[PDB]
Write a protein that binds this ligand. Structure first.
Ligand SMILES: Nc1nc2cc(-c3nn(Cc4ccc5c(c4)CCN(C(=O)CCO)C5)c4ncnc(N)c34)ccc2o1
Lengths: 308, 176, 684
């Protein structure tokens, strides 16, 4: 599975995690995840193993061996886990749980406890890491965003005009913009400081885009920072260009459209939907270049590591 | 009961002849007795398990409602017109709904009909007489003034504006 | 009292104005009412100016001096305003009682109360009898004497209106209550001496047919085993069991009592001996032996029980069988104006409704010549229903006294409730009514539709519905809704009508009653309104609510499955209205009712306060946590916020048209509905 320069995986309600080869498309290995669904998947920077977040526990499988069942398990939390992250050094893991708390965990230290905790009002939806790997952004159902500093331990708060749930947020790789999306289909974009670290974090809102007419479920920047993708429940995935924030392309499947992943060079897009299938599209031509199927139930979470 | 008992054993060809005779009767006379008897028969057949009488490829909702309107049985007309609405709304059914509700002493239902029309059919489809039917003499005046502005002198709009002015009691402008 | 508010420079001015108004014409009721209410306000303003300031020696003495000039005028004005009403005067009476049980110990206020109580009629006190017996044993010494004297005076005349609650109070675990009740009953004895004995006998016999040994055990053993095996609570287990072993000791006094004892007495006695072995030994195996014996008893009753379908009085209570031509009035019928009606005799058989609670169906034969049917419940507290019914009566009067509401026949349907103890009671029998659950079940079985179609589709789409996140749940809910028709109720209501001109009136009544009880229940805080808790008439469409256990947002704060809804408004209920939607009768009736309620906030806040401040019931609130005074203050503040429009943001002040819209938006939401407990049927 891990031999290839690209790793692809998807999961949903059917209790199975499956891996696919991109060039032509065929399953190569399956893993069992009984007794719950999967909310998120993430591949560690070391390019070894993978983490799945579900109900009351986080599990880790392996990519290089391809034989074994879970290697590491974290248990003893309340309600669902909504997000997972990793530090580029592979020593700290950040999680925004359902029960109004964000937590930090140590991988090598096998003490079954989170090193640091940070509580907030209302459940947490998304968490994100600043490129400098010194700040953390958190979103909650109350409609507020929180900025937390790991080294100084002080936090600050923000609230856009509507008091509606924030569903996702993400900071591009060069720390030039930061965007968020709310359940009314609107997106907000804010400009950021040039340098990263030891900065005043001059978050000033450039504008808001009425991207959709229904719930928005995710948004991501391209690795080159040129493009910004936005999924939704209206069977539309829209791509905007960062130079002018104007629509470039609009992919449609007329189930919802959950996931979204870019390629290492901003050439392809990989998308998952609630119709038990995954699609690989060309960014420029806007045509389905391939399809992956085999799942019995819907597919909600996706993972695509295009690096080695 | 006799009609039901007989109809069940009839042959597909004899049923069509009977239906044709009933249709001819319903259209022909204004006899209050015959129309009431046939309407009661239709209702009774509706309540049973044999299905409603198959008149004129539509179950006769339009014809039955039209004939019930003249007989002055407004509940039946409202029921049939409500069935008509479910099949599909059009700006011509809403006016009849408003009129029927007004004839039945139920202004609030007519107000609800107007609210639905406002939400679902924009502006161009709204007529200035609907306000007149609801005794909203000010919105009708506003709409009539707006219409008279654009269009030239047409007798109907002028008469409508005069009618609206009379109810409020503006003797000055009316006399002018 | 506008453009200014309330201060220390304005109060004297307005008191001057109202005093002059009273002086110029000493027969107007409004002047006296306003003066009394204004004096009552001042007193409550100088207290929260102390708690807010003083808490956060000379102060208390200065408070005594200053505050002893507003209370006496308030009492006098309230009494004179009562004298000039002779009719709707509930608010003034409740205010008088509130002042009395808060400042009576002071000497001069007692003088004013003593003077006033003499000059009023005795019929003005028959509407506050439930609120007088609650304070029958007040610690203070100057209040209890006057309460006892007034209660005795209410006994010479109109005695039929005091026997039931006094008898209920006479059998209480706490000693002072039963001491006072027995003293008052003794004082009453020299008036009748047969009515009292008949009432005691009837109450005792009724409290007994309600629950039988096999039953008390079928549950005692269940509860004791849950405590011990489920929770390791040996002490709690014994606290359930010890009383049950003791009771049989008294010794059988009726046939059925003996047959249980003959079947199961030896086994139960031996189980107690094993438990008593444990008490000395400390060896848990001895409890295991006991539970082997208890389980054997439990299973035999478990299979014996289901076949009891009726009860004969001769094996249950011959005392009732022998009763003839009593002098006791039929429960819940006494009216000081109409002639009295007595119970001629009781029917010999009782029918047991097949359910988990197993309520009885009692029937009595009145002296008038008609039968009276009742429902006899056991294991259920029925006082919160009495209070709520009083409130509903007040609201009915308020609606009836308005022209716009009068032209529409807006009202609330109520029934009769009579408590007998802390556990059992009687409820009036309402004819021609059926729950929604039964109607939908019958319709779906007649048309041959699966009874759990929506839940089955939901589970098929994803068999983890209870553990999914929020956005995951809303999609499944929408999918389940979009692939089904929700027009069962409308179709059923059309079919069950004889003609087409009756269906119209039935639909109108249905819509208007639904709107009225939605608006009232929002303010009352009522919750837990699953389809089994509301019924529907047949000759009319008027709706009826029941089971008022939960109030004051109790269900919006619980830990497991907290509700997020102000009232029930689902698609099945909506489809049964006119084809256009909610913007017809429903919204306008909501506007009218909310206007009427907002105009008369004072009476509603009088009734709800006496209710929340009664010490015998405050138990429903403190249990929510995991002192009580602060919780009561918070509850009353929330109710005021609701009734003033400041219920979404304290800074704003909404008008009715705007608030109603926000409430209707909040109720019909998929995010809110998807979170409901699956037994709530959020899809019907
Ligand atoms: N607190 C409280 N309860 C009350 C009950 C009634 C009442 N209800 N009904 C029908 C009925 C009677 C018994 C049962 C059901 C329905 C449903 C099934 N069931 C269960 O026990 C399992 C269900 O979950 C037994 C009446 N018919 C005529 N007159 C009445 N007054 C009533 C009224 C006020 C009440 O106030």
């Amino acid at each position: 599975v891990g031999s290839d320069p690209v790793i692809l995986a998807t999961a949903g309600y059917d209790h199975t995690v499956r891996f696919w080869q991109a060039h032509s498309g065929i399953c190569t290995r399956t893993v069992q995840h009984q007794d719950s669904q999967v909310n998120a998947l993430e591949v560690t920077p070391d390019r070894s193993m993978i983490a799945a977040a579900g109900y009351q526990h986080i599990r880790m499988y392996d990519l290089n061996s391809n034989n074994p069942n879970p290697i590491i398990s974290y248990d003893g939390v309340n309600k669902n886990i909504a997000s997972v992250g990793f530090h580029e050094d592979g020593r700290w893991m950040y999680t925004g749980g359902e029960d109004c708390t964000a937590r930090i965990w140590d991988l090598r230290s096998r003490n079954l406890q989170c090193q640091r905790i940070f509580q907030v009002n209302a459940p947490i939806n998304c968490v994100c890491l600043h490129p400098n790997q010194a700040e953390l952004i958190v979103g909650d159902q109350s409609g507020a965003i929180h900025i937390w500093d790991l080294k100084t331990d002080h936090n600050e708060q923000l609230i856009p005009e509507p008091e509606v749930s924030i569903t996702s947020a993400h900071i591009d790789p060069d720390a030039s913009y930061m965007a968020a999306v709310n359940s009314t289909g609107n997106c907000y974009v804010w400009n950021l400081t040039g340098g990263i670290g030891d900065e005043v974090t001059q978050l000033i809102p450039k504008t808001k885009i009425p991207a959709h007419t229904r719930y928005a479920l995710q948004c991501r920047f391209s690795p080159d920072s040129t493009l910004l993708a936005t999924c939704s429940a209206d069977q539309t995935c829209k791509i905007w260009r960062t130079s002018n924030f104007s629509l470039m392309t609009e992919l449609s499947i007329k189930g919802w459209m959950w996931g979204c992943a870019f390629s290492g060079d901003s050439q392809y897009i990989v998308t998952a939907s609630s119709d038990n299938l995954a699609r690989l599209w060309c960014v420029e031509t806007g045509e389905i270049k391939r399809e992956y199927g085999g799942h019995q139930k819907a597919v909600v979470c996706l993972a695509f590591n295009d690096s080695v | 009961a006799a009609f039901v008992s007989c109809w069940s054993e009839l042959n597909e060809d004899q049923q069509d002849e009977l239906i044709r005779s009933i249709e001819l009767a319903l259209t022909s006379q204004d006899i209050a007795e015959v129309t009431q008897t046939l309407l009661n028969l239709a209702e009774f057949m509706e309540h049973s398990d044999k299905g409603p009488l198959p008149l004129r490829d539509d179950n006769g909702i339009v014809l039955l409602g039209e004939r019930a309107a003249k007989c002055r049985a407004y509940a039946k007309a409202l029921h049939y017109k409500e069935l008509e609405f479910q099949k599909g709304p059009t700006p011509a059914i809403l006016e009849s709904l408003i009129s029927i509700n007004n004839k039945l002493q139920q202004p609030e239902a007519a107000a609800g009909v107007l609210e639905y029309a406002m939400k679902h059919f924009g502006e161009l489809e709204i007529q200035a007489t609907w306000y007149e039917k609801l005794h909203e003499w000010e919105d009708a005046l506003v709409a009539y003034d707006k219409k008279m502005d654009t269009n030239k002198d047409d007798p109907e709009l002028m008469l409508g504006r005069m009618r609206c002015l009379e109810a409020l009691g503006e003797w000055g402008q009316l006399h002018q | 009292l506008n453009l200014q508010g309330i201060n220390e420079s304005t109060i004297p001015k307005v008191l001057q104005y109202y005093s002059a108004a009273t002086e110029h014409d000493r027969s107007w009721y409004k002047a006296w009412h306003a003066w009394a209410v204004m004096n009552f306000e001042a007193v409550l303003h100088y207290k929260h100016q102390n708690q807010a300031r003083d808490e956060k020696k000379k102060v208390t003495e200065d408070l005594s001096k200053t505050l002893l000039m507003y209370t006496v005028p308030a009492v006098q004005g309230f009494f004179r305003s009562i004298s000039l009403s002779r009719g709707n005067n509930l608010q003034d009476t409740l205010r008088v009682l509130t002042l009395w049980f808060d400042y009576g110990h002071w000497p001069d206020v007692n003088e004013a109360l003593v003077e006033g109580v003499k000059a009023i009629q005795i019929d003005t006190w028959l509407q506050v009898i439930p609120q007088l017996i609650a304070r029958i044993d007040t610690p203070r010494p100057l209040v209890g004497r006057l309460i006892h004297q007034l209660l005795t005076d209410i006994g010479r005349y109109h005695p039929q209106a005091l026997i039931y609650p006094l008898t209920v109070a006479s059998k209480s675990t706490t000693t002072a209550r039963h001491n006072a009740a027995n003293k008052i009953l003794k004082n009453m004895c020299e008036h009748s001496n047969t009515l009292v004995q008949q009432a005691m006998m009837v109450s005792e016999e009724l409290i007994r047919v309600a629950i039988l040994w096999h039953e008390m055990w079928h549950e005692g053993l269940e509860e004791a085993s849950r405590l011990y095996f489920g929770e390791r609570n040996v002490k709690g287990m014994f606290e359930v069991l010890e009383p049950l072993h003791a009771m049989m000791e008294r010794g059988p006094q009726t046939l059925k009592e003996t047959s249980f004892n003959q079947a199961y007495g030896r086994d139960l006695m031996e189980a107690q001996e094993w438990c008593r072995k444990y008490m000395k030994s400390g060896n848990v195996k001895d409890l295991t032996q006991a539970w082997d014996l208890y389980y054997h008893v439990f299973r035999r009753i478990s299979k014996q029980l289901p076949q009891l379908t009726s009860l004969e009085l001769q094996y249950v209570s011959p005392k009732l069988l022998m009763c003839r031509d009593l002098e006791l009035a039929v429960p819940g019928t006494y009216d000081p104006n109409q002639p009295i009606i007595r119970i001629q005799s009781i029917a010999p058989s009782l029918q047991v409704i097949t359910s988990k609670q197993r309520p009885r169906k009692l029937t009595l034969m009145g002296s008038n010549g008609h039968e009276f049917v009742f429902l006899l419940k056991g294991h259920e507290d029925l006082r919160q229903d009495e209070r709520v019914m009083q409130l509903f009566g007040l609201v009915n009067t308020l609606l009836a006294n308005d022209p716009t509401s009068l032209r529409k026949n807006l009202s609330i349907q109520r029934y009769a409730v009579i408590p007998l103890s802390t556990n059992s009671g009687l409820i009036g029998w309402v004819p021609h009514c059926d729950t929604l659950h039964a109607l939908i079940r019958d319709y779906r079985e007649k048309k041959k539709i699966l009874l759990n179609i929506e839940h089955r589709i939901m589970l098929r789409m994803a068999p983890d519905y209870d553990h999914l996140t929020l956005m995951q749940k809303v999609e499944v809910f929408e999918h389940a809704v979009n692939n089904t028709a929700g027009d069962d109720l409308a179709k059923l209501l059309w079919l069950k009508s004889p003609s087409s001109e009756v269906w119209f009136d039935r639909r109108t009544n249905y819509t208007r009653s639904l709107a009225v009880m939605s608006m009232v229940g929002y303010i009352l805080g009522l919750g837990d309104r699953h389809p089994s808790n509301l019924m529907l008439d047949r000759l009319s469409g008027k709706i009826l609510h029941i089971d008022f256990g939960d109030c004051f947002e109790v269900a919006m704060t619980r830990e497991k499955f907290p509700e997020k809804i102000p009232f029930r408004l689902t698609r099945m209920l909506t489809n049964a209205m006119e084809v256009t939607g909610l913007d017809g009768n429903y919204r306008i009736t909501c506007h009218t009712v909310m206007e009427v309620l907002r105009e008369h906030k004072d009476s509603v806040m009088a009734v709800l306060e006496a209710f929340v401040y009664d010490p015998l019931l405050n138990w429903r609130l403190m249990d929510t946590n995991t002192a009580l005074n602060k919780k009561a203050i918070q509850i009353i503040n929330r109710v005021r916020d609701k009734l003033t429009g400041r219920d979404f943001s304290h800074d704003d002040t909404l008008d009715v048209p705007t608030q109603v819209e926000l409430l209707i938006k909040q109720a019909t939401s998929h995010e809110n509905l998807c979170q409901c407990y699956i037994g709530w049927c959020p899809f019907w």
